[PDB]
Design a protein around this ligand. Structure first.
Ligand SMILES: CC(=O)N[C@@H]1[C@@H](O)[C@H](O[C@@H]2O[C@H](CO)[C@@H](O[C@@H]3O[C@H](CO)[C@@H](O[C@@H]4O[C@H](CO)[C@@H](O[C@@H]5O[C@H](CO)[C@@H](O)[C@H](O)[C@H]5NC(C)=O)[C@H](O[C@H](C)C(=O)O)[C@H]4NC(C)=O)[C@H](O)[C@H]3NC(C)=O)[C@H](O[C@H](C)C(=O)O)[C@H]2NC(C)=O)[C@@H](CO)O[C@H]1O
Ligand SMILES: [Ca+2]
Length: 273
């Protein structure tokens, strides 16, 4: 088959030596790589920029004529990634080379047969500060109709976290928005944990770290990200080949999702970044 789906909760991706390169989530769809050798035990695959090997034990073959395969599609204004059958995210502006309503396929969301995307937020150095002020960040809640968020009116805390830890506050807002449903998930409300800190796939709620209050949750999560990712040379969102997404999340499109939120916020606030 050309496409395979991940069966267990997570599955590893390996190099030719059998060394672990990353891990990907249940239901993820990987492409068979016909330029490398597969055998009975391991398939040469590509996923979210990463070319490696997966155990056949962890995979189920798909039929693209009846099973969902992730794809990209333009509405004539934005290009969307269908990451699941009923969920899309905007990744880029429409390019004249895109046919509206045509499904496109890409192993990295950057290289397509007929055009190339820039996803600048996906590769932006997260140690560079946002050009948004605390007051501008606070405006996003009204502009994106975000109701009942624990993060409302916390722009000043995001900017303090940026000042102190040298981590982009637009990224911190977008990461908390995506990971905790704008500070409305049960982990957010119970644990003041807006960033999925130690929310492991096997037991996400139980494993998630606890913080004392909303401000200590924003500052403590920022500290944790700085010490565990930025200071260890993971300085951009990325994908399964490089960046924070290699280790931070099993979801192969975690980085693309956060970059999409950054893109949406930046457009609403006037394009300063
Ligand atoms: C279309 C769209 O936009 N959809 C949105 C939707 O995505 C939103 O929902 C949110 O989705 C997120 C994924 O995109 C999901 O992310 C989860 O987040 C945590 C943190 O990122 C992550 O946890 C990782 O788990 C692994 C284990 O599986 C750990 O790796 C282990 O670490 C051990 C110790 O270091 C090590 O011994 C083990 O060997 C290793 N295991 C493996 C297999 O390698 C990670 O630990 C790392 C390595 C570390 O210590 O640094 C751990 N990361 C961290 C930082 O702790 C999950 O993988 C990830 N899940 C997926 C599928 O990616 C959000 O989940 C949150 C946390 C939650 O469950 O509440 C999810 N949020 C919600 C609210 O559902 C959605 C929001 O509503 O919005 C949609 O629009
Ligand atoms: Ca190696």
């Amino acid at each position: 088959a050309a496409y395979y789906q991940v069966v267990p909760v997570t599955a590893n991706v390996y190099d030719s030596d059998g060394e672990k390169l990353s891990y990907i989530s249940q239901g993820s769809v990987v492409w068979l790589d016909k330029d490398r050798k597969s055998d009975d035990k391991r398939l040469a695959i590509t996923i979210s920029g990463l070319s490696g090997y997966m155990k056949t034990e962890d995979l189920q073959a798909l039929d693209a004529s009846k099973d969902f395969i992730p794809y990209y599609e333009s509405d004539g204004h934005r290009f969307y990634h269908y990451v699941a059958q009923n969920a899309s995210i905007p990744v880029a502006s429409h390019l004249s080379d895109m046919e509206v309503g045509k499904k496109y396929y890409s192993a990295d969301g950057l290289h397509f047969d007929g055009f190339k995307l820039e996803n600048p937020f996906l590769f932006k150095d997260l140690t560079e500060a946002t050009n948004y002020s605390a007051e501008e960040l606070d405006k996003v809640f009204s502009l994106l109709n975000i109701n009942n968020s624990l993060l409302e009116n916390k722009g000043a805390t995001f900017k303090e976290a940026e000042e102190h830890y040298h981590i982009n506050a637009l990224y911190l807002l977008a990461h908390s928005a995506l990971q905790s449903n704008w500070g409305r998930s049960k982990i957010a409300k119970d644990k003041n944990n807006f960033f999925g800190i130690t929310a492991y796939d096997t037991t996400p709620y139980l494993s998630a770290k606890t913080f004392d209050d909303v401000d200590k949750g924003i500052l403590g999560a920022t500290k944790w990200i700085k010490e565990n990712y930025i200071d260890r040379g993971r300085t951009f969102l990325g994908n399964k080949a490089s960046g924070m997404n290699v280790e931070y999340a099993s979801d192969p499109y975690w980085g693309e999702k956060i970059a999409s939120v950054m893109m949406k916020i930046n457009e609403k606030l006037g394009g300063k970044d």
